[model samples]
Target chain A: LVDTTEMYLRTIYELEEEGVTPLRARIAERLEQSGPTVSQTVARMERDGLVVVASDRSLQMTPTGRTLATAVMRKHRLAERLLTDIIGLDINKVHDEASRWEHVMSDEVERRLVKVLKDVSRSPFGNPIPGLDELGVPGTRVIDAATSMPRKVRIVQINEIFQVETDQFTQLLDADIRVGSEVEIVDHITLSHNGKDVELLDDLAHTIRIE
Target chain B: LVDTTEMYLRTIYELEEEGVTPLRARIAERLEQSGPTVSQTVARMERDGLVVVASDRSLQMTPTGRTLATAVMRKHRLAERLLTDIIGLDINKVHDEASRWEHVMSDEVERRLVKVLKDVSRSPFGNPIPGLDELGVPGTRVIDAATSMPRKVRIVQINEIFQVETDQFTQLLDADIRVGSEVEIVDHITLSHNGKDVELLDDLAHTIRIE
Candidate 1:
């Protein structure tokens, strides 16, 4: 099934996303699979144009592999939110569950998950969902929204510094603030999401940490 | 990958579920695939222990193929109900979306959706979710539950005859009389779900059509 290959791509992509140099051993460890098995699958993935190997046997994803990884990662992150938020699954237990969900989430459910999930680019566990650096995402904190031009930007992350704060968290969710969500600054204190303006009286919106 | 093989199995399984003879042409038509492509995939599926061709040129599932088909069908039908019920998707639009969702639904989410769906064994759009025929399902009506041994039984289908009566439907759902739910009649006109007895004064309980 595409699932086996898809798991390999996602595993490699996760290591790469974590800024690690992925080797077959590391992949095997993360997958809890054997070394020879990982090596065999990696070799097949290379032949399938999904990865490239360096002389050191380190791995890097080809563009094709990266695309598949991104889609799978999206499913993973969205599923995390679905499990924890909508399904009321304990946040501690959701990762393993979401891991299984990522492989089979369809493109349609992915799109719909975007609509349902409060955040798309980050997990409820306060982990990043792997996103573009070319865009100002994963960018600096919003400093009053005045210094940054009213250029189109997205909320890539919520500072995990605020992770344990439930009151503020509920407020942000009420405001529909989430990673990968688009926002425009109408003024220094006003942020607009989907034409609805949300006013920030405190620094929590600053903690929103937009691009 | 297994997905390609799984798709072939599911296609063949759907035909068998619907009581249709799964010929190569019908498989191709249902999958929107070319004749040669369907032929090639079916051949591959046979090699993978997923299907067998009958002397009459119809496709049948091996035990292995049937298992995969049941899991996939369960996901597909559950996804349809999830999209329509949780995501508030239009009933008319859910089938196609669920089709894509079926292949990727994680086992964790599949388990979770059973709790989320009011009737996990069927779709909100009124379709059977492909169940175990040997489970004493789709067997009998609830009207005779009083005369029949008050032993355990599952409500299999809600006769479409009663599907349009929203007032009655709401009461049945409020009473927890859902398809595939466990219940037992203690008296001539009462059944218990989750340890609470619900009175069955209307024909709707009889219309619940249990087995």
Candidate 2:
């Protein structure tokens, strides 16, 4: 159910993550829109708070835009991968099938999918994705600890985390993080510093390696 | 979205699978439904396609009904489990919170949650749900292999031969299942003979492995 614009920005971000650099021409070709249409769409999205263009006019998703794009992209790719890989579906048809259902993915259903599939990651062909760090509790989020001890966590944002002990996180993300890693911190990080740590996490949660 | 009737039946199926037979008062108390309401609803659902009650009024879901119920139950329980465990949301809050979104868990989104969250199966605390074998493919039903594959699978399914040959499927099925199992035909199972299969089920291709 993602509209044309949402899909356009999501594809741009996805391509950028995969090193496509997401030029207007490539985005146009990938999504079957004309270059001019892609250009107009990008300009409108920037105006509407969905994306940003660098000095070179290469695309970048803003925090607000990336959040929506990430969720939509997440649902789209997961559908494509699950349908084609798990159900033995024709690879050629996966794009349409996935795009069809991407908009309908509800948060409730997404929560269960996060837990059950365990292997669901970045995107089609295992692309990496950045985190927006929007949800979770306030204060030091638990990434993971291997004392064989129970872990305590709080998340102020998806990517952001203020770990009491950075060394422990090194171990936490080791097993769980690959390029397509998916991990949910236990609590939100509300800090005296205005949650800078999680903001870094928001920008780079994709880089964190905790299970 | 699944309706309230579906949740009630699936809950009982879950308890039954765990070796407990729920009585009228027990079901009503557990679900917090009025005794009269539970009886009426159960009776109506039994008449519809939701549940079956034994002569003693103990509950069981019909095969078709159980298949659908299993999906919903899996969604609800896995969400609650993730909230309480990995995400560290309030334990008591999980039930009501999860319930609110349980019906909203779309199949596409639920599949994503399964892989991304790795939070599924072994209900909440990790007690294994019995009879998962009968549960159909775990993700989206992208293909109806029965219709998609060749007409005659006289075409043996894998297990029948692998069990005899290499035991390749001995450790099949993990958390995701990728939705379908791999397939192979055995030596004894004839792909074609006298313009037909060995059993004379005609020249139609019969069965195929999902993979």
Candidate 3:
């Protein structure tokens, strides 16, 4: 599972796409802290492959960073739709609800979102669905997994219960990892030394697709 | 240029599509209306080409009525998009705002509503946006008024001066008629002594696609 620090780093990439650059001042406001706290966010974003510091402290997302952020934005919008639409929530409250749900949408649940909602749409508040038409039409035929050779797949669905754990988050890191994306399995440890099932995660294991 | 009664009729039709058929009793409940009030609305709806009452008093729409109601729904959803995306309105507020804007959206403004928003997708609420797939694709088009020979064109926007007047109501009535559906000449006195020139109204003029 990619850590919260990593999630925040990529979120900045999404923010930059929306015209928020050099997020120092805003980060202070967001976290309700003084200036130095903003620096920590910047420092962490830098350590990860997410951001490149610019001359004016306006960090730019590396290709890796943008790749990460797009995934976050996608998940956030989908969560908003599922909450507001099928659940009949007020459109205004979708953002706050989505904030908590975004971190927990596993690659599996995200696929269901992509499937159930169809692909070419937007958040309830009308942000373009991140990769629907940009990728393919929503709800189109996807490659069947049961007919294919098995490989290590990425995690797409996070257990719904974990959304409330503010201190932790688990999400598939690879943006392209979807229902039909390729996968390769290394070791499926049903019972490990700690007596718990363990799946080796890298930047890769966040996605689940069979090839 | 359908009347308010027709819109109500259409609304009932759409509600029925969702499996919520509004009988006289249900209509009263759905609108929080009194039984007499619901009866009156249904009666008026039938008279104005808006709705029909089955032998059992089940309110539904005719084919012609259904078409206009659909146009109204399209307007409502697209207007929601306008408020949410271009205007950056509060999410909850978009519904009411769009409701107001949809009923009053001039044909001219409707042309630009979806166009200026630069978005082409279904309503975020899951209703289809007619021909949404062509939104970002080049060569995409949505036809409004068809072509005709060049002719006299008048540049009258919505005249706010008559906003709440019965005469203003007449103008809107005239305008909807002009939505390529009917001709409505306002305040024409039968008395020969009254020297008044026939003028197209704000609502009426908007519908007149001059050729």
Candidate 4:
């Protein structure tokens, strides 16, 4: 598959998983591409039978597209595991490296990687790897859960979108927050953990899942 | 650096190492790119100060170009070693995979790989990894050395070019011919070893090195 196609498909898949509408505008924003570029590429994708445009102008992947997208996502998350678990790369830096590795990995390489990374079902950030587990975790958005202040919750997963925002992800790391970490919700935008108060953006709270 | 730039620079560096003058025609043939495409890209490379076109129309990399090219080659050879040694990818299959891996590997990844593959100074095919050792080896081309019939020789390196020709490489593998394998030259185009006689084409003989 073309790298751009794999990227777009994975983006759409993630958007769907996040309960967001997959519109051309959102894709353009997510990819940092211009509106015309996204539209032209989406048009080509539609013509190629990889996607279908609904009456409301939202995008949906065809079965073939979804299959390809899931494969790329699996390779991507697996690569993240390899980079962090095997290669000892920092968690905050794995996403960028895995983004490139995902496209280059062949099915044979993926199979070999699976053998090497036996029983790994989640990415470093705790998101389920496609094909290995279900799409969503059993949890509520941290934003919603934070309404009850002083409640303790375990982080289930960090939003996959944060992979693109290195500074914010680094902040999360520096604050000692990660998957399975127990934190007390001091307020809607403040997390109390590791004997310190970590202030988080509302946007970040919306993406973090807790249970 | 752009992927195309990396590919071209590496190709030029390999051509120079092989004692072939870097010309547009030679590059086009080596990369299987059209003549016009190579000319246009070479022009762009010259404009970018990565290369210079001499009055004789031969291509020469600038110091900066050489530096970048050497870096890529080092990553490529290192990646080959990682694939074959750690990942267990077939030796004949590694070059193609390493081509993509080379472009994606960061300096940090390269350093980590060096740590993982301690004391590795050559690729699976016995080429000296650019940064770890000097160019060339203590050997003569098998074709040149084959003049003495029935002489015992040890394989030192296989030319990097055969990495693109899988069928031929697979034949070498099937015959159990590899770096450090001792074989007796029956004639200029024939090898006698392991109780089997293997016939090699002149082109293949030109690339195989023996000591």
Give each prediction's DockQ, rounded to 2 decimals: 0.19, 0.04, 0.01, 0.22
State which candidate, 1 or 2, has the greater lDDT: 1
Candidate 1 vs candidate 2: which has greater TM-score? 1
Candidate 4 lDDT tens digits, B75-170: 899889888887787555688988888888876677677777755688888888886432321467778777554777788887756655455676
**Comparing candidate 2 with candidate 4, which one achieves the higher DockQ?**
4
Write down the TM-score for model 4. Answer: 0.61
Lowest lDDT 10-mer window, candidate 1 chain B?
B131-140
Judge candidate 4 at residue A56 and give its lDDT: 97
Interface RMSD of each: 3.9, 8.3, 18.2, 2.6
Give the Å shift of residue B173 in candidate 3. 45
Sorted into a CAPRI-style docking class, model 3 comes out as incorrect
| C-alpha lDDT of residue B204 in model 1 | 53
Off by over 4 Å in 1: A1-9, A16-19, A32-71, A88-93, A104-108, A119-121, A132-211, B1-6, B16-19, B32-55, B60-68, B88-97, B106-108, B119-121, B132-211
lDDT of 4 by residue, A7-93 (tens): 999999989989999999999999999999999998999999999999999998999899988988998998898888777875667
Candidate 1 interface RMSD value: 3.9
Off by over 4 Å in 3: A1-3, A31-33, A118-120, A132-211, B1-211
What is the Cα-based lDDT of residue A59 in candidate 4? 96
* Residue range A75-194, candidate 2, lDDT tens digits: 676656555544444565567766655665554444444554445555456664233132110222233322233332322333325443355344334433323333333322211122
How are the candidates ranked when ordered by DockQ, highest leading? Answer: 4, 1, 2, 3
| lDDT of all predictions | 0.71, 0.53, 0.51, 0.81
> What does candidate 2's lDDT look like per residue over B34-69, in tens digits?
999998988888888667777887776788777777
Compared with the true structure, what per-residue lDDT tens digits does model 1 show for residues B1-211? Answer: 2276767777887787678888999988988899999888888888887888889988888998888888787777777778887877656568776766676666556656666667666667566777434232255666764644455667777675755545555656776877888888655467777766666655655676555
Which tens-of-lDDT digit does each residue in A64-177 have in candidate 1?
888888777767877788888787765656887777667656654655666776766678977676632322234546655443435455787777576554565665677677
Ranking by TM-score: 4, 1, 2, 3
